[PDB]
Ligand binder design. Structure first.
Ligand code: A1AQK
Ligand code: FMN
Ligand code: ORO
Ligand code: CL
Length: 366
């Protein structure tokens, strides 16, 4: 395990990234993954890593965040990498191109990326048919502890945001274990204002009504994904709405439009969302706040700057039931998944936790 980890991190990934433009590298990764052209995921998930949340068993708590597989092209390969769950998207109702290229920027000195993809999407119909081709394969994966999430976006030119999300619920809800109402992209004008109170309640009420109208075996959990850049007022409002409406969970967080002091990359002042190490503690502290504001009663998927077991455990102890990563894969490659899992298991044992479940929210009980 550590042989591949070292070779990928120290040699292969920096060599490939030096040869390719960042979006070309992303596209090749999706292709390689879809073909199963992957190193051995030698790590054997233990019982200590199993989590039951959102109406499902998760074999391990480490998922691939939205954005890597926007169009649901690489789901099976992502499970092959050792992720306990996969999230695809964001998917918009109609196909759209997204922003002009270049729209992805590497900050290797910061272990960070900035992106402004702008919801490039094949659209709901294409993704629906892609998922339908493997629907029963997924049902078996889910039953075996490997659930599927689908992240829903809105078209750039839509005049009714709630209707775009409702369309997504109707089309992809029946193929998903959970849906995500992504109200936190930094790269669609007006999107993040959907995080504000009266409008948020109206939007989410409509989404939940649509979800509730699906047949039982086709009825997903609904999560809201939030930004790391919210005001205290915004966080309080979101917590209140989520509890009022019975939203199933939160994903905390998307990328940041802030630029923390200390970024070194030449491209630090590009427009877009920043991910990776500089986001990490901003995301952990957002988890911590949302867990407290929801009394520990609302499952949180923690995301932002996770690249080690320590990073994962810090988010779990702050209140996450599950974690996701994306940016670390760009630096470390596929072996990062097993690395995080191995390190997390070791830390759980070292800190006296019987398993992941026992660690969820543990900092709040100190
Ligand atoms: C943020 C956009 N973005 C960037 C640029 O910022 N990079 N990136 C990734 C690239 C790669 C690549 C490229 C370098 C060929 C290979 N592989 C890999 C290696 C060996 C075997 C199987 C694969 C898939 C990965 O895992 C991988 C993952 C990524 F996230 C990505 O999504
Ligand atoms: C290239 C790229 C594209 C992304 N696209 C999406 C997206 O379509 N929907 C979404 O909810 N989050 C998207 N994200 C955000 C990630 O899901 C995640 O919240 C964020 O990158 C923090 O995790 P990380 O530091 O492990 O990358 C994207 C991130 C990156 C880097
Ligand atoms: O498509 C994108 O630009 C994108 C969407 C999202 O939610 N987050 C992000 O960082 N980028
Ligand atoms: Cl770059």
């Amino acid at each position: 395990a550590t042989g591949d980890e070292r070779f990928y991190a120290e040699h292969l990934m920096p060599t490939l990234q030096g040869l390719l433009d960042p979006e070309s590298a992303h596209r090749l990764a999706v292709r390689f993954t879809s073909l199963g052209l992957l190193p051995r995921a030698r790590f054997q998930d233990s019982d200590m890593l199993e989590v039951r949340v959102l109406g499902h068993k998760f074999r391990n708590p480490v998922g691939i965040a939205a954005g890597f597989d926007k169009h649901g092209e690489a789901v099976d390969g992502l499970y092959k990498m050792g992720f306990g769950f996969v999230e695809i998207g964001s998917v918009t109702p109609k196909p759209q191109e997204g922003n002009p290229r270049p729209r992805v920027f590497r900050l290797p000195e910061d272990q960070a990326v900035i992106n402004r993809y702008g919801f490039n999407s094949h659209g709901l119909s294409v993704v629906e048919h892609r998922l339908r081709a493997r629907q029963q394969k997924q049902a078996k994966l889910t039953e075996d502890g490997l659930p599927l999430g689908v992240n829903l976006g809105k078209n750039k030119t839509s005049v009714d945001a709630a209707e775009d999300y409702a369309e997504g619920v109707r089309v992809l809800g029946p193929l998903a274990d959970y849906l995500v109402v992504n109200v936190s992209s930094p790269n669609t004008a007006g999107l993040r204002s959907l995080q504000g109170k009266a409008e948020l309640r109206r939007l989410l009420t409509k989404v939940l009504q649509e979800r509730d109208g699906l047949r039982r075996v086709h009825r997903p959990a609904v999560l809201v994904k939030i930004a790391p850049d919210l005001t205290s007022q915004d966080k309080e409002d979101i917590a209140s709405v989520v509890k009022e409406l019975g939203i199933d969970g939160l994903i905390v967080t998307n990328t940041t439009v802030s630029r923390p002091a200390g970024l070194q990359g030449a491209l630090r002042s590009e427009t877009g969302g920043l991910s990776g190490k500089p986001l990490r503690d901003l995301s952990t502290q957002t988890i911590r706040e949302m867990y407290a504001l929801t009394q520990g009663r609302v499952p949180i998927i923690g995301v932002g700057g996770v690249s080690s077991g320590q990073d994962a455990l810090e988010k779990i102890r702050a209140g996450a039931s599950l974690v996701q990563l994306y940016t670390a894969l760009t630096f470390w490659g596929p072996p990062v998944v097993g690395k995080v899992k191995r390190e997390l298991e070791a830390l759980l044992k070292e800190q006296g936790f019987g398993g992941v479940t026992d660690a969820i929210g543990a900092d709040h009980r100190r």
